[PDB]
Design a protein around this nucleic acid. Structure first.
Length: 111
DNA sequence: GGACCCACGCAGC
DNA sequence: GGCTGCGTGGGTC
């Protein structure tokens, strides 16, 4: 039974063409595969890839799918390190990214 | 209240 | 006293 989260070759290519780095590709796949976390409710703020820091854990099956697409597209010579040090931190940064930077909230507080 | 990306000091572990 | 994600801010678009 094929998964409904699967992306066509054309869809993957359109995401790759916008990706600045393999880490950014992982983050873009995260947004595409977890739409429920990227609504105006920002449920993403309650999740990270592992459940560390007393947060909820991203669906392990879709996290494996992100890694599958990363490994199907990008170089694999150092894939363990790319996943651990580039893709995982990019995924977590995308979940926790504030809609407004603290320095901008305070800079407007003068206006 | 721009959206977005990634580097990096830090606290908790 | 190293490793893991958070909070943060410089920077590009």
């Amino acid at each position: 039974v094929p998964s409904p989260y699967l992306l066509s070759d054309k869809e993957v290519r359109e995401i790759v063409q916008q990706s600045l780095s393999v880490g950014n590709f992982a983050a873009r796949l995260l947004v595409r595969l977890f739409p429920e976390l990227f609504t105006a409710e920002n449920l993403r703020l309650q999740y990270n890839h592992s459940g560390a820091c007393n947060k909820k854990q991203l669906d392990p099956t879709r996290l494996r799918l992100i890694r599958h697409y990363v490994e199907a597209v990008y170089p694999v010579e150092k894939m363990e390190e790319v996943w651990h040090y580039e893709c995982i931190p990019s995924i977590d940064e995308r979940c926790r990214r504030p809609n407004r930077k603290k320095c901008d909230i305070l800079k407007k507080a003068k206006k």
